[PDB]
Paper text:
To understand the molecular basis of P2B4 neutralization and antibody evasion, the cryo-EM structure of WT 2P spike in complex with P2B4 Fab was determined at 3.8 Å resolution. We further used local refinement with particle subtraction to obtain a high-quality reconstruction for the P2B4-RBD interface at 3.5 Å resolution (inset). Consistent with membership in class II B8,, the light chain interface of P2B4 involved CDR L2 and CDR L3 but not CDR L1 (left). In addition, the 17-residue long CDR H3 of P2B4 inserted into the central ridge area of the receptor-binding motif (RBM) in RBD that would block cellular receptor ACE2 binding. Some P2B4 binding residues S52 and T53 in CDR L2, as well as G100, I101 and R103 in CDR H3 were in the interface potentially interacting with VOC-associated residues E484, Q493 and Y505 (Figure 4B, right, (C)). By testing a panel of pseudoviruses containing individual mutations of antibody evasion, we found that F486V in BA.4/5 and E484K in Beta and Gamma were the key neutralization resistant mutations for P2B4. In contrast, the Fab structures aligned with VOC RBDs revealed that E484A in Omicron variants or E484K in Beta/Gamma eliminated the salt bridge interaction with R103 in CDR H3, resulting in significant loss of neutralization against Beta/Gamma. Y505H in all Omicron sub-lineages might create additional hydrogen bonds with S52 in CDR L2, compensating for some lost interaction with E484A and Q493R, explaining the conservation of P2B4 neutralization against BA.1 and BA. Similar to class I ZCB11 and class II LY-CoV555, F486V was the key mutation in BA.4/5 near the CDR L3-RBD interface, accounting for complete loss of neutralization. Since V486 with smaller side chain did not seem to impact antibody interaction directly, this mutation might alter overall RBD structural conformation, destroying the hydrophobic environment at the spike-antibody interface.
Here we determine the diversity, potency, breadth and structural insights of bNAbs derived from memory B cells of BNT162b2-vaccinee after homogeneous Omicron BA.1 breakthrough infection. The infection activates diverse memory B cell clonotypes for generating potent class I/II and III bNAbs with new epitopes mapped to the receptor-binding domain (RBD). The top eight bNAbs neutralize wildtype and BA.1 potently but display divergent IgH/IgL sequences and neuralization profiles against other variants of concern (VOCs). Structural analysis consistently revealed diverse modes of bNAb action due to their distinct binding footprints on viral RBD or spike proteins.
Numbering used by the authors:
A (entry chain H): 2 to 52, 52A, 53 to 82, 82A, 82B, 82C, 83 to 100, 100A, ...
B (entry chain B): 14 to 69, 77 to 247, 255 to 347
C (entry chain L): 1 to 107
D (entry chain A): 348 to 529, 544 to 595
E (entry chain B): 596 to 620, 641 to 676, 689 to 694
The structure:
Amino acid sequence: VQLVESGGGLVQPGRSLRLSCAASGFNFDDYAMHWARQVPGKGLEWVSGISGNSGSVEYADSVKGRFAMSRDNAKNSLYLEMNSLRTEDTALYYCAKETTPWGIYRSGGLDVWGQGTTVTVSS
Amino acid sequence: QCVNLTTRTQLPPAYTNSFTRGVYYPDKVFRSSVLHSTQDLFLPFFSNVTWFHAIHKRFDNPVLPFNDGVYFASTEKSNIIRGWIFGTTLDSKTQSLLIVNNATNVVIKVCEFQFCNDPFLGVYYHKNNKSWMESEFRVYSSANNCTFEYVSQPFLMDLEGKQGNFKNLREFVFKNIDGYFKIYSKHTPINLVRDLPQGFSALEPLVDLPIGINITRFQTLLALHRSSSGWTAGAAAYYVGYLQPRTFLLKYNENGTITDAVDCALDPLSETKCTLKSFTVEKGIYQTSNFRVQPTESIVRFPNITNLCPFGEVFNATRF
Amino acid sequence: DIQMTQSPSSLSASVGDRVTITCRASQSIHSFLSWYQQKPGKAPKLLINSASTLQSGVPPWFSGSGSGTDFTLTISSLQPEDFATYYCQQSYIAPWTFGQGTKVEIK
Amino acid sequence: ASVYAWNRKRISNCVADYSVLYNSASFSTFKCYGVSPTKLNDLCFTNVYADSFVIRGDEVRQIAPGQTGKIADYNYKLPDDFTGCVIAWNSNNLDSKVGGNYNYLYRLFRKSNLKPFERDISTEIYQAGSTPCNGVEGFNCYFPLQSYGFQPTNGVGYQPYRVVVLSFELLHAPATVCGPKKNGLTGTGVLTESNKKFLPFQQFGRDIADTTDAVRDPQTLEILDITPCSFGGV
Amino acid sequence: SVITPGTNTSNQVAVLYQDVNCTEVNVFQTRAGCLIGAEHVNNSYECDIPIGAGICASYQTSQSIIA
Ligand SMILES: *[C@@H]1O[C@H](CO)[C@@H](O)[C@H](O)[C@H]1NC(C)=O
Ligand SMILES: *[C@@H]1O[C@H](CO)[C@@H](O)[C@H](O)[C@H]1NC(C)=O
Ligand SMILES: *[C@@H]1O[C@H](CO)[C@@H](O)[C@H](O)[C@H]1NC(C)=O
Ligand SMILES: *[C@@H]1O[C@H](CO)[C@@H](O)[C@H](O)[C@H]1NC(C)=O
Ligand SMILES: *[C@@H]1O[C@H](CO)[C@@H](O)[C@H](O)[C@H]1NC(C)=O
Ligand SMILES: *[C@@H]1O[C@H](CO)[C@@H](O)[C@H](O)[C@H]1NC(C)=O
């Protein structure tokens, strides 16, 4: 079980900057993958999530309609598209797999944590 | 199987009243020479019943409910009506109570049966040397997960398709009380043509089988007798009533056989009998019940004088 | 969403005493909560799932309970390797919210 | 059987020796409502129905009439008028193997409260009042059937307690199950056997005061017209 | 209150709703209340059935209840 993140960097708010979290040491199943972010200096915030049999996408309250999701189970890689960036999005991005792919009680996931790529959105 | 009958002629939905019919014994209690009142689901008096026939030009089997109470009164000549169907949804998803009469025994089976749109029975080969022999069985298609089986005493039915006036009644009331399915029966010779007599026939319980199932709707089995879709039935008629939670008054003789009964919530004269606990009432004035006014609207009572939002100096403003 | 409040915002404790940590929801939450621990500059690790179930690798001196809306959490004895921040997190409905934090320091 | 589909067993036509169940290997609780656990031996009953299901040691107190919680209002509810006995015992050896043998599916959510003596088999998705689920289970769409998740190393509040609930009915019909004492109607009177009109289904008689005045003899079908003992002022 | 002639006299009913007018329910309003099933008859007979307010009921011929 190893999660490797990449794609972060300096980006002016307004343009795209695509990042990826690599999934390794994880057998193929119906687990729900979620995102996570954290601005340094304070606690955590949740970004997005994708569950089994595709569909079922959801974001946080104030980030509606500016991120795009696609999951490829063959490559075992995760893709998030960046769109309409603002200055408050500066954080280190965390990817979690929640490791409870049981049909009964898929929720309450044990959020695994990788190294975490950092995005610096400076004006 | 998928056999359907097209020998049904359209008839208007008539109604028939019940004068003093639909009263049974409420429990296993012996009462003698005592006027006792009880409260249980019986058929209310002066109530319309549905118009259904089991004859060769009307042949019907709608799906009719069970939870509202059923009063089954049928007049029989040549034993066309054999069995009844009871179930929750009347498919194989849930359990069902089946009563089948194959002219030898009153067989009761409680399994996960499957029905078509019109189950019936087939008495065929009436060309020459008929002798009224059974030919086919079209009650169910398949059965599984049986939970109860009952076999009655053996006897012999007279399957000769006689024609004429009705000579008997077979009245039945069906209700399930904590899984106990109670079947009431009564058999009295009369003569009539179409309707029911405006008298009394005190029904008696026959069997109380341990069932436990839920029964929302119900149907019935009717036979066919003609001298696959062109066969007709015999000469029978059945009526369906509805039972209500009304209090009734019962009088008992020396044997404790009920000779007559009244409904308390029918007529204020019957309210007097129900209050005075006597079938005979002398001349006078008696209190029966209490009058109340049923309200129509339920309003939370209550209007307000509240301050209005300052919309004036932001809407009709001299300069924006 | 869900407004999550935690009390107290800060605390000071020694080694071996008793400290109670509580979070309060705005509605019925039943038991879908998590107890988290966060060292500065380190990855998170779950301790208590569904507010009563111990996680693997956690010795049983971390005990939490509660039902309905108000909850509680009791620490039997403190160690040098627990002085960090705490939050309350739920898993009922549309986007989740974390706690505001509570720091325990050497007194 | 599981909690969402509890087994309902009918017993009849047998003598029930309750005493061996009364004193045996340790039952965790014995709470009989409306029936004496001590005087039960000299009783006759009309029907005995068992309700076998497995719960933890925490919500055993919820299997009792008049209280709410997580299970008593969602899986199994007893009537307010309840004449029966509740039994429970630990099953740490017979069940709860290491690895989560959770064939113990219990329902989490229901549309409304549960009327007594009702089972729920259908596993349709929970409420989702804002956004209809439309037959998916992605998010805000929970499978209400939940596995208990038992482990043999769990605490005493997380141990599988096999709960059997017995329900009876006292002195209102012919009795098919009786005690070990060598048709169950008990009373004091003088037998004045006469020709009361026995209808083929009748089993007991009653006077104006709703007391027993005539009793069907258990062996033969004739009538024991009981009469209260002679008494008066002195 | 209902005037019952006697079960072994007849079966007709003169039902008296007490304390009410004849609008909230052979119509006659008493001080006792509204009366239905009986027709007002000015000419006076001997009292048989007491209801109140100086009003009584009897049976005079075709048989019907009179107030
Ligand atoms: C009862 O039957 C009569 C006669 O057919 C009919 O006129 C009347 O409308 C029926 N009333 C109801 C409530 O069915
Ligand atoms: C009761 O039945 C007997 C027959 O054994 C009969 O002689 C008697 O008249 C009956 N009494 C009734 C019906 O009141
Ligand atoms: C406002 O309406 C409420 C509604 O119940 C009522 O109780 C209250 O008296 C009203 N107050 C005023 C000032 O109208
Ligand atoms: C009442 O009963 C008696 C006795 O049978 C009978 O003669 C009379 O006609 C009945 N009716 C009245 C109004 O008296
Ligand atoms: C009944 O209604 C009449 C209609 O004119 C009215 O005059 C009278 O006041 C009402 N109340 C009583 C007690 O008569
Ligand atoms: C009583 O007198 C009134 C006076 O207007 C008259 O109209 C009525 O016909 C009389 N008879 C009755 C009510 O029988």
